[PDB]
């Protein structure tokens, strides 16, 4: 046995790190952890975002129906009204409607050549659970969300996020909220390809109908390039020609794959979603 | 190289091999069933078959009596050979013994065999039996046989 306490203490700390790593503890809400003041956290949330929220509206936006029903069940179990707590349902609906109309206006003005179906799919992707939950989690919305279950269900988190938008709309108005939607939802299109957000089937069928609407002849498929035709790794470039004029060209490992890719390229050009299109303008409105 | 070498190398040399085989054969004649290492039983089985042939020559054949005197170390067994074992096989031309492999010996895991003179009074060994003629395969072959015999007579 060696004299001393420092080495033993240090080894205890390491034994406690290893024990925790072997059995990671079940996660808990940040509010349940130490160093939490809800009122201070609410105020910082608005200040981080450079938004002049109304603290009464902002707090209600975080209150969910599930948290109210469970809070009452706990009250009944303990035999304990003062729980006249308003949910975020009304704010959620207002924010959801505004976001959809606002995103539709942003996208219609930017890409006038996209049909309504495409714009609707883009709005559905931007306001979908996956995108909205990612943005909400990285804006501390989940920490401030009052929910019955933790981790907060994705549908609940999405509802809370749009409730916060509703609170902003009442607090600051449509113009200020539109900038918020531009800076945290429109940005989520960065790098995305058109058909990575708008999931379509049979692009050639869609292309033929669009060209008919434009009074353009049906596209003829032709082989522009070819390599390794008889091998296990072919390359094909299929070009689509309208009146013997090239509209689009697409590569693929098979002629069928190359042709379908060429149709997608034609659709991207027709709708103004080319990879090299003018980037979205985030500059302050004049 | 051991091409065409029909005899095993056992014991301490050629003489000891014969003595080892003789003691086994003497045990077999007395008890009519013995168990021993498989290789040694296989070696001795040839001698046990030929001993019966000498016994069939009769106790008046001096050559047969000398052979029996050498191979049977217990002399009460010589009357048994000429008067019990050899008469029992009077109507056979061979196949006096049966040799079957038994589970490996416990101590040294040696391969083991049981050998007996057929027609002894001891409880019968659990001999291997071929599948019944009533099995699916054997019935399908019986039909094929019946069919072939009918076509030949026609």
């Amino acid at each position: 046995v060696k004299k001393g306490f420092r080495a033993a203490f240090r080894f205890q700390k390491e034994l406690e790190r290893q024990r925790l790593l072997r059995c990671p503890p079940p996660p808990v809400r940040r509010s349940e952890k130490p160093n939490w003041d809800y009122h201070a956290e609410i105020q910082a949330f608005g200040h981080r975002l450079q938004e002049n929220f109304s603290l009464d509206l902002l707090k209600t936006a975080f209150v969910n129906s599930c948290y109210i029903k469970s809070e009452e069940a706990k009250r009944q179990q303990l035999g304990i009204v003062l729980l006249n707590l308003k949910s975020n349902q009304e704010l959620s609906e207002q924010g959801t409607s505004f976001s959809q109309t606002c995103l539709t206006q942003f996208l219609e003005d930017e890409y006038p050549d996209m049909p309504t179906e495409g714009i609707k799919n883009l709005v559905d992707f931007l306001t979908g659970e996956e995108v909205v939950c990612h943005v909400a989690r990285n804006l501390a919305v989940e920490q401030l969300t009052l929910s019955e279950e933790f981790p907060v269900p994705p549908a609940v988190l999405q509802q809370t996020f749009f409730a916060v938008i509703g609170a902003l709309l009442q607090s600051s108005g449509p113009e200020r909220t539109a900038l918020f939607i531009r800076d945290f939802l429109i940005t989520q299109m960065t790098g995305k390809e058109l058909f990575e957000m708008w999931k379509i089937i049979n692009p050639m069928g869609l292309l033929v109908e669009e060209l008919k609407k434009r009074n353009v002849s049906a596209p003829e498929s032709r082989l522009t390039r070819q390599s390794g035709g008889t091998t296990a790794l072919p390359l094909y470039f299929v070009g689509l020609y309208c009146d013997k004029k090239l509209i689009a060209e697409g590569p693929g490992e098979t002629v069928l794959v190359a042709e379908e890719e060429a149709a997608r390229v034609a659709l991207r050009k027709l709708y103004g979603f080319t990879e090299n299109r003018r980037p979205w303008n985030y500059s302050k409105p004049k | 190289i051991s091409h065409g070498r029909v005899f095993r190398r056992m014991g301490l040399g050629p003489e000891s091999r014969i003595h080892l085989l003789r003691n086994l054969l003497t045990g077999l004649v007395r008890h009519e069933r013995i168990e021993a290492p498989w290789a040694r039983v296989d070696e001795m089985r040839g001698y046990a078959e030929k001993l019966i042939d000498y016994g069939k020559l009769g106790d008046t054949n001096e050559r047969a009596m000398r052979m029996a005197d050498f191979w049977l170390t217990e002399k009460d067994l010589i009357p048994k050979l000429f008067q019990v074992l050899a008469p029992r096989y009077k109507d056979q031309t061979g196949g006096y013994t049966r040799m079957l492999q038994i589970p490996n010996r416990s101590l040294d895991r040696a391969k083991m065999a049981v050998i007996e003179y057929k027609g002894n009074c001891l409880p019968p060994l659990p001999l291997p039996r071929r599948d019944s003629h009533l099995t699916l395969l054997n019935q399908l072959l019986q039909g094929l046989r019946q069919d072939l015999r009918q076509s030949q007579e026609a």
């Binding site: 296990a232 790794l233 | 490996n104 895991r109």
Partner: protein, 166 residues
């Protein structure tokens, strides 16, 4: 010494919910201080690994090694223990999930050499460990086929980027 293997049969799981699937039974058993080498015993524990309880018992019954008779004795008492204590319905519905050997506590003795020289011999001991799981033996993994090889090769050709540039 450590004796954690004997404590794994004392874990009590919470009752399952109505919708959850049937949880297979797990039975841990071992034998300590076997007068046999862990290196030789490893070849026997490796043999029955993954087998059914009845196939493992059949292979060990006709093996000539001394460890075979010891493992078979451990498997029989783990089979009986499974049905009697661990609520296993069918005694044949078991397979060898884990089976290995471990070094035991050994003794040292002198081995005499010529010229007044000597060596130290270890009188070796080993442990044998087995884990039985309720159910049929998991099917063996089929060997990789040409279609899978080509599919993986093309997948590597499609995952390659332009390195050290924009």
């Amino acid at each position: 010494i450590s004796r954690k293997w004997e404590k794994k049969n004392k874990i009590v799981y919470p009752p399952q919910l109505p919708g959850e699937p049937r949880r297979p039974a797990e039975i841990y058993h071992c034998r300590r201080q076997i007068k046999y080498s862990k290196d030789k015993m490893w070849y026997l524990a490796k043999l029955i690994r993954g087998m059914s309880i009845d196939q493992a018992l059949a292979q060990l019954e006709f093996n000539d090694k001394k460890g075979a008779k010891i493992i078979k004795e451990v498997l029989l008492e783990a089979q009986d223990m499974a049905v009697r204590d661990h609520n296993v319905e069918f005694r044949s519905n078991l397979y060898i999930a884990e089976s290995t050997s471990g070094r035991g506590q050994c003794l040292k003795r002198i081995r005499y050499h010529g010229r007044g020289r000597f060596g130290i011999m270890e009188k070796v001991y080993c442990h044998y460990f087995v884990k039985l799981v309720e159910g049929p033996p998991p099917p063996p993994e089929p060997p990789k086929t040409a279609v899978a090889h080509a599919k993986e090769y093309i997948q590597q050709l499609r995952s390659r980027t332009i390195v050290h540039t924009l």
